C-alpha cells in the first residue's frame, strides 16, 4: 500500500474528520470535504461513483472556478513516484492499483464534463484549449480509448409527429405587426405562442444556472443567461397584463381586457402551461389589479370560475398545483417560480461550510440538496409542443418591455396609483372615462376553428 509523500502529492493526505465527512455499507455518501478531498473522491482509486460525479459537475461552480477545477484534475492525474522503502513488485502494484485507476477516473470526469456541461467550454475557449492540450499528453492503449471518446464529443459539440393546428387570427391580420395587441390577436394564438416561447425558455435553463444563487451575483449574465431570460420574461409578461388592465381607463373596455386575459388563462390550462397559468394568477392578485371591485363585478360567472380554479392551484403552498403537475401527461410547461423558491429556501437554511476542529469543509450535502431540485426541473425539459410558431407573434412577445427604462419600484407605483385613478377608493364615486379602442371588444372565444 505504497503512496507518494503528501508533501509532493496533496491527494495522499490521510482522511480525517478535518478534511472529509460522510453521511450518517459499501460506498459512502459524502457530506462535506475540502476541495482537495472532494476531487480525490471524484477520482477515487478504489471505485467509480457516477452519482457523485453527476452531482459534483452540476454544483462545483459554487465552490471552485472551471479553470481551477481543470488545474486540480491535472494535479490529480500527474501522480509522482511513491515514497521508497529502504530496499518493483510493490512498485508495479502501485501503478496497477493506484495510478491506472485514478488516471482513468480523471479521464471519465473530463468525459462527463464535456458530455453534459459543455457550456463551460463554450463560455471559455481557453478552458477548452487547456483541456485538449491536457488529454493530448495522455499515453497508453487503455486511456487513449477515453481520449478518443472525449475528442469525439468535443468535435460533435463544436458542430452543433402529426400536423399542428391552423394558426388563429382575430382583428390583427398576418403580417400587420403594428396592429398586434392584447385584444387584437386571437386569444387562442396568444396562449399558443406564449406557450411555445415559455416552453423554449424553460428547456434552455441548465441546472448549474440555479446553484449558489449565481443569478443574483456579479457575473449573472454569463453564469445564468437562460435562467435570467425566464425570470425576466415572467416579470415582463405579468407586468404587461397589469399594464393592459389599468391603462384601460374606460370600465367596459377594462372588463373586456380582464375577460380576455382569463380566456388566455383557460387556453394555458388546456395546454398544461402552468407557468402561464400562474403568471395570469399573479397579475390578477397584483396590487394594481386585485383592488378593482367594479371590474371584477362584471366578469361572467363561467370566467370567475376559471380564475378561481387557477387561483386555487396556488393555495396552501401550491398543493393542488403539485398534484395536478404529477397527474397530467406531456407536453407541459411546469410553473418555474416554485423551484426558485425551494432552492432559495435550501440555500438559506444550510451553511456554505461545516467546521470540524476549527477547519472549514465545503458543505457538499447542501449542493446535493439543490441539485435534487434542479433534477426535477430537468425531468420536464424535453416536451415539445405540436404547435406552429408564428414568427411575428413570437417576436411581439419576446419584445414586451412594459417598464421601458423605468425600474420596477417606480413602475409598480405608477400602475398602483393609476388603479386609484380609474377606480377611486371606497367613499369616492366612480368617474366615467373615454374609450381608447376603436375596434370591437367582443372576443372570438377559445374554441379552435
Amino acid at each position: 500500500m505504497r503512496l507518494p509523500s503528501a508533501d509532493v502529492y496533496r491527494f495522499a493526505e490521510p482522511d480525517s474528520e478535518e478534511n472529509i465527512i460522510f453521511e450518517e455499507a459499501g460506498i459512502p455518501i459524502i457530506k462535506a470535504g475540502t476541495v482537495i478531498k472532494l476531487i480525490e473522491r471524484l477520482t477515487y482509486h478504489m471505485y467509480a461513483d457516477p452519482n457523485f460525479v453527476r452531482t459534483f459537475l452540476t454544483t462545483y461552480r459554487s465552490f471552485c472556478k472551471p479553470q481551477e477545477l481543470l488545474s486540480l484534475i491535472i494535479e490529480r492525474f500527474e501522480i509522482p513516484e511513491p515514497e521508497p522503502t529502504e530496499a518493483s513488485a510493490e512498485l508495479k502494484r502501485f501503478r496497477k492499483e493506484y495510478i491506472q485507476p485514478v488516471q482513468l477516473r480523471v479521464l471519465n470526469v473530463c468525459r462527463h464534463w464535456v458530455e453534459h456541461h459543455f457550456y463551460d467550454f463554450e463560455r471559455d475557449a481557453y478552458l477548452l484549449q487547456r483541456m485538449e492540450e491536457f488529454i493530448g499528453t495522455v499515453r497508453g492503449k487503455a486511456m487513449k480509448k477515453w481520449v478518443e471518446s472525449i475528442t469525439k464529443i468535443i468535435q460533435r459539440k463544436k458542430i452543433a409527429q402529426s400536423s399542428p393546428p391552423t394558426v388563429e387570427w382575430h382583428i390583427s391580420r398576418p403580417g400587420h405587426i403594428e396592429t398586434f395587441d392584447l385584444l387584437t390577436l386571437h386569444p387562442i394564438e396568444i396562449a399558443r405562442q406564449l406557450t411555445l416561447l415559455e416552453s423554449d425558455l424553460y428547456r434552455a435553463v441548465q441546472p448549474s444556472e440555479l446553484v449558489g444563487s449565481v443569478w443574483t451575483k456579479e457575473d449573472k449574465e454569463i453564469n445564468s443567461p437562460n435562467l435570467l431570460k425566464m425570470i425576466r420574461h415572467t416579470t415582463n409578461l405579468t407586468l404587461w397584463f397589469e399594464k393592459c388592465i389599468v391603462e384601460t381607463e374606460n370600465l367596459e373596455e377594462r372588463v373586456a381586457v380582464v375577460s380576455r386575459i382569463i380566456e388566455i388563462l383557460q387556453v394555458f390550462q388546456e395546454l398544461n402551461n402552468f407557468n402561464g397559468v400562474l403568471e395570469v394568477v399573479s397579475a390578477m392578485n397584483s396590487s394594481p389589479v386585485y383592488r378593482l371591485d367594479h371590474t371584477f363585478e362584471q366578469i361572467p360567472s363561467r370566467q370567475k370560475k376559471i380564475l378561481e380554479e387557477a387561483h386555487e392551484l396556488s393555495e396552501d403552498h401550491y398543493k393542488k398545483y403539485l398534484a395536478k403537475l404529477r397527474s397530467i401527461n406531456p407536453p407541459c410547461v411546469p410553473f418555474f417560480g416554485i423551484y426558485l423558491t425551494n432552492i432559495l429556501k435550501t440555500e438559506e437554511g444550510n451553511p456554505e461550510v461545516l467546521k470540524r476542529h476549527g477547519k472549514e469543509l465545503i458543505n457538499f450535502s447542501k449542493r446535493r440538496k439543490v441539485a435534487e431540485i434542479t433534477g426535477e426541473i430537468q425531468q420536464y425539459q424535453n416536451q415539445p409542443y405540436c404547435l406552429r410558431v408564428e414568427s411575428d407573434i413570437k417576436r411581439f412577445f419576446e419584445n414586451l418591455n412594459p417598464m421601458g427604462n423605468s425600474m420596477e419600484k417606480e413602475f409598480t407605483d405608477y400602475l398602483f396609483n393609476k388603479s386609484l385613478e380609474i377606480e377611486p377608493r371606497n367613499p369616492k364615486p366612480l368617474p366615467r372615462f373615454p374609450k381608447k379602442y376603436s375596434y370591437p371588444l367582443k372576443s372570438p372565444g377559445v374554441r379552435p376553428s
Epitope: 390578477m284 392578485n285 397584483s286 396590487s287 386585485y290 383592488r291 378561481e308
Partner: nanobody, 116 residues
Framework: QVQLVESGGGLVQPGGSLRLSCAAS????????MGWYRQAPGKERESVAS???????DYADSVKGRFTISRDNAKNTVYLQMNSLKPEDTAVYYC???????????WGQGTQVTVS
C-alpha cells in the same frame, strides 16, 4: 375566511397618538389586502387605509400625513399608527382583509376611538 382580532383604541387628547393592531388567524403574507375602515357618528363607513403584500398603500385624504398602516409578518398583525389625532377622527375603527378568488372580505369586531 379570516378571523381578525383588534386591540388598542380608547380615549386620547386632541393632538395625541394611538396605535391600533389587528391580529389575523392565518399567515398575513398570503393576504392580498389588509386595511382599516371607520364610521364616525352620523356618517357612513369609509376606508381609512389599505396595504398590499408588496407594500402599496392608499389613505383617505383626511388622514394623509397623520396615519400610517403597516404589517408585521412575524406576528400576523396589521397596524394603524394614528398621530396628531383630531376630534373628527372619533369613530369606530374596523380591521379588514380582502383576499383570494373568490374575493372574500373579512371584518374585525370594531374598536372605539375617542378624541376629546
Amino acid at each position: 375566511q379570516v378571523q381578525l382580532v383588534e386591540s388598542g383604541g380608547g380615549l386620547v387628547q386632541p393632538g395625541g397618538s394611538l396605535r391600533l393592531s389587528c391580529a389575523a388567524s392565518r399567515s398575513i403574507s398570503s393576504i392580498n389586502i389588509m386595511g382599516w375602515y371607520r364610521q364616525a357618528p352620523g356618517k357612513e363607513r369609509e376606508s381609512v387605509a389599505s396595504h398590499t403584500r408588496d407594500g402599496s398603500t392608499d389613505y383617505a385624504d383626511s388622514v394623509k400625513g397623520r396615519f400610517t398602516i403597516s404589517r408585521d409578518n412575524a406576528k400576523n398583525t396589521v397596524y394603524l399608527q394614528m398621530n396628531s389625532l383630531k376630534p373628527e377622527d372619533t369613530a369606530v375603527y374596523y380591521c379588514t382583509t380582502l383576499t383570494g378568488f373568490p374575493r372574500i372580505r373579512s371584518w374585525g369586531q370594531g374598536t372605539q376611538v375617542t378624541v376629546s
